[PDB]
Design the sequence.
């Protein structure tokens, strides 16, 4: 019944390859989001300039 | 009447080949039983595992 011990090791592996990964589709998003942040930044200038001029 | 002595030896043999065997149909049983014991033993594992898991 080391087999159990085995099947234990199996069992603990059994419920070890499921739901043990939080928030990574969450995390990639941030950067994937933040990528979008990277772009309109330059627009701020003429926006300011417009506000600056006007 | 050594014949008696003979028939004695006969007589003691007479009631010697009857009822002088205890419990052997009793004994074989144990093993014959115990044979049955030998089998479900392995079931205990998943039984445990089930209890172990759950």
Sequence:
């Amino acid at each position: 019944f080391t087999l159990i011990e085995l099947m234990i090791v199996i069992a603990i592996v059994g419920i070890l390859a499921a739901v043990a990964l939080p928030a990574y589709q969450d995390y990639t998003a941030r950067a994937q989001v933040s990528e979008a942040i990277l772009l309109a930044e330059g627009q701020k200038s003429a926006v300011t300039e417009y506000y600056l001029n006007h």
In short: The interface with chain A takes residues 44-46, 48-49, 52-53 of chain B (CB under 8 Å). Chain B is about 75% helix and 0% strand. Residues 46 and 52 of chain B are 8 Å apart (CA to CA). Residues 24-40 of chain B form the longest helix (17 residues).
